Amino acid sequence: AVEPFPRRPITRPHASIEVDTSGIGGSAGSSEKVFCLIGQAEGGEPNTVYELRNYSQAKRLFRSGELLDAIELAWGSNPNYTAGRILAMRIEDAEPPATWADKLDKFAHEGGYYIVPLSSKQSVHAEVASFVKERSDAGEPMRAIVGGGFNESKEQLFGRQASLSNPRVSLVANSGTFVMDDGRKNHVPAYMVAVALGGLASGLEIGESITFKPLRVSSLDQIYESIDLDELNENGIISIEFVRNRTNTFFRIVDDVTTFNDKSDPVKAEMAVGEANDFLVSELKVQLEDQFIGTRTINTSASIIKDFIQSYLGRKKRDNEIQDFPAEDVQVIVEGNEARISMTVYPIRSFKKISVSLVYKQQTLQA
């Protein structure tokens, strides 16, 4: 803005100052991913959302229940990365709830992106799928991560992935044994592994894949063979590989394939680039809206909007949230009611194939 000093005008001879702050006013940084959990628990009032920052704070707001273990796994499984905020909600009817759709809505305008329901029921999975679709269509992009029960055959997994083929749901096959800060080792259903994967994905930078990131678990109940893992990957089911040929044995997340059945478009198939797309569109929308709508269509606006877009995309390039963009494709056309804007973006892709061609050749040494 620009402001007069004094604010009240003066008629008689005087000096007055007009001051412009746009050059020092800040700007919104890169948005933050926040992780959402819905859980059976003991503790605080049900059906309200708590922002949580510390395990101690969580262990005061909640006690002795699977939600608190889920929060523990969510922070503990990503040691290398900054521990983000978590949004958590106990659920009980004011007895077991018949439906969660009535409660999921209380997340709707929270600043939250990844959802995990702490239950195995396919109906709950469908409910959260519908909710994530709803909010995305409303313009609040979200994703869900989903998992089975304690132990499931490939047949059951394929059945579930049939029941939910969706670009905003991911299914986690493996269930395993974790080790807890309480000095406890517990067998858990696969959705707790999905909690771990959501913690890692929400910790990672925007547009960074969970594929081939390590996972920390005491054991897995199902150790899938190479053909088994290829089968599940073809079906768009996330699987955990036990690395055995290395001297050190550890568990990899094999891939970040969504449950969606068509692999031809990566923006729908792969979580990372879909997330990058979601954040890029959301930030473009909200920033252009608050920047320009209602402003006067002064003759130079065709410059100013191009300069704004080029600045924004330069900032996106700086953070490695896009690969590159052509500056000259940023083009603006102004008509009396409307700004019409064109841009090209090169998005950032994770490496998923490396092909080495090795040519043996002779050289004649001589002396």
The footprint of a second copy on residues 254-313 (CB under 8 A) is 262-267, 277, 280-281, 284-286, 288-290, 292-299, 301-303, 305-306
Instruction: Please name the helix (run of DSSP H) or strand (run of DSSP E) that holds residue 125, with its range, or none.
Output: helix 122-138
Binding window for a second copy (CB under 8 A); candidates: 16-24, 67-75, 87-95, 100-108:
16-24
Q: How many CB atoms lie within 10 A of CB 154?
A: 15
Residues 88, 209: contact at Cβ < 8 Å?
Answer: no
Q: Which of 18, 95, 155, 181 binds a second copy (CB under 8 A)?
A: 18
- d(C-alpha 205, C-alpha 276), whole Å: 10
DSSP state of 66: H
Q: Which two tokens stand for residue 209?
A: 């894949």
Q: Quote the crossing angle between the two packed helices 154-163 and 226-234, to the nearest 10°.
A: 10
Number of residues that bind a second copy (CB under 8 A): 109
Which residue in the block uniquely carries the two structure tokens 């059906």?
Answer: 47
> Under rule CB under 8 A, which residues in 51-70 are in contact with a second copy?
53-54, 57
Q: Tell me: cis bond preceding 326? Omega within 30 of 0 counts.
A: no
Question: In this complex, which beta carbon is closest to a second copy, that of residue 187 or of residue 349?
Answer: 349
| Cβ 206 to a second copy shortest distance, Å | 10
Instruction: Please name the helix (run of DSSP H) or strand (run of DSSP E) that holds residue 70, with its range, or none.
Output: helix 66-76
Q: Which of 55, 81, 212, 308 binds a second copy (CB under 8 A)?
A: 212
Binding window for a second copy (CB under 8 A); candidates: 41-49, 94-102, 116-124, 334-342:
334-342
Residue (of 190, 174, 170) closest to 128 by Cα position:
170
Residue 250 backbone phi and psi in degrees, to 5: -150, 170
DSSP state of 328: G
Residues 164, 129: contact at Cβ < 8 Å?
Answer: yes
Question: In this complex, which beta carbon is closest to a second copy, that of residue 98 or of residue 245?
Answer: 245
Q: Is 17 in the site for a second copy (CB under 8 A)?
A: yes
**Entry field: residues in the chain:** 367
Residue (of 190, 183, 204) closest to 70 by Cα position:
190
> Under rule CB under 8 A, which residues in 110-149 are in contact with a second copy?
136-139
Q: Which of 227, 244, 249, 328 binds a second copy (CB under 8 A)?
A: 227
Q: Is 354 in the site for a second copy (CB under 8 A)?
A: yes
Binding window for a second copy (CB under 8 A); candidates: 66-74, 114-122, 215-223, 355-363:
355-363
| Cβ 319 to a second copy shortest distance, Å | 11
Binding window for a second copy (CB under 8 A); candidates: 7-15, 32-40, 64-72, 88-96:
7-15
Question: In this complex, which beta carbon is closest to a second copy, that of residue 53 or of residue 121?
Answer: 53
Question: In this complex, which beta carbon is closest to a second copy, that of residue 5 or of residue 182?
Answer: 5
Question: In this complex, which beta carbon is closest to a second copy, that of residue 119 or of residue 259?
Answer: 259
Angle in degrees, CA 128, 133, 138, rounded to 5 = 125
Q: Is 355 in the site for a second copy (CB under 8 A)?
A: yes
Q: Which of 95, 246, 249, 328 binds a second copy (CB under 8 A)?
A: 246
Q: What is the CA radius of gyration of the chain?
A: 25
Q: Is 366 in the site for a second copy (CB under 8 A)?
A: yes
